[PDB]
């Protein structure tokens, strides 16, 4: 027997930002010690480690509009 | 026998931000010590670890409008 | 026998923010010690650990409008 | 025998924020010690742990309007 | 025999906030000690633990209007 699939998505979205002014973003951490003690580091199959860190991230987009879209069609028989 | 699928989504959304001014974002942590003691670090199949950290994230979008959309069609027989 | 599916969603939503001014966001933690004692760290199949941390996150969107939408059609026989 | 499905949702929603001014958001914790004692950390199938933490999150959207929508159609025979 | 389903929801909702001014949000905890003593940490199938914590969350939306909607159609035979 026949089958029919019409996969027809229509998109007219708007992801809009309007910022008149952005200013005076201060970022002054004091910073502290990190002391890590260990003996061995046996790692395996999938490891995303991080041992000992002082990260400082300043992220000022002036418009950081994201849009994630995901389409999928699966056919079996 | 026949089958028919008409997958027809229509989208006219608006994700809108309007910020006249953004300012004076201060970020001043004092910072403290971190002391970690261990003997061994045996890791395996999927590990997302983090041992010892002072992270400082300043995130000022000026419009941080997200929009996550996900479509899926599954056909079996 | 025949089957018919008309999957027709219509969307005209609005996710709207209007902020005249955003200011004076102060963020000044004092910061304290962290002392962790252990002997071994045997991890396995899915682990999302975090041992010892002073995180400081400042998040000022100026409009942080999210919109999560999820469509799904499943067909079996 | 025939079947028919007309899945027709109509959406004209509005998720609206209007904030004239946002200001003077102060965030000054004093910070305290954390002392954790253990011997072993055997983890398994799905673990989302966190051992020892001083998190400080400042979240000022200026409009934080969320909208979660979820559609699903399931067909079996 | 035939079947027919017309799934036709209509939505014209409004989730509206109007805040003239938001200000002077002070957040100053004093902070205290945490002492945790243990011997072993055997975890298993689904664990969402948290051992030892001083979390400080400041959340000022300026409009935090949520709207959760969930549609479902199930067909069996």
| SSE class of chain A | mainly beta
Oligomer: homopentamer
**Order of helical and strand elements of chain A:** EEEEEEE
How many strand units of chain A?
7
Shape of chain A: flat
Q: What is the first-to-last residue Cα distance of chain A?
A: 12 Å
Q: Number of DSSP helices of chain A?
A: 0
Strand content of chain A: 35-45%
Q: What composes the largest sheet of chain A?
A: none
PDB class: protein fibril
Keywords: Tau filament, Protein fibril, Positron emission tomography
Assembly: pentameric
Entry title: Straight filament from Alzheimer's disease with PET ligand APN-1607
Task: Walk me through what this model shows.
The structure is a homopentamer of 77-residue chains. With 77 residues, the first copy, chain A, is mainly beta. Chain A contains no helices and 7 strands. Chain A has strands spanning 3-7, 10-11, 14-19, 34-37, 56-59, 68-70, 73-75. Chain A is flat, with a radius of gyration of 25 Å. Chains in contact: A-B, A-C, B-C, B-D, C-D, C-E, D-E. Chains C and D meet through strand 1, strand 2, strand 3, strand 4 and strand 5 of C and strand 1, strand 2, strand 3, strand 4 and strand 5 of D. Chains A, B, C, D, E: The modification Omega-N-methylarginine is found at residue 46. Chains A, B, C, D, E: It comes from Homo sapiens (Human).
């Amino acid at each position: 027997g026949s089958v029919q699939i019409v996969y027809k998505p229509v998109d007219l979205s708007k992801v809009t930002s309007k910022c008149g002014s952005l200013g005076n973003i201060h970022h002054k951490p004091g910073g502290g010690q990190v002391e890590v003690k260990s003996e061995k580091l046996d790692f395996k199959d999938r490891v995303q480690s991080k041992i000992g860190s002082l990260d400082n991230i300043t992220h000022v987009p002036g418009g950081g509009n994201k849009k994630i879209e995901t389409h999928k069609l699966t056919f079996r028989e």
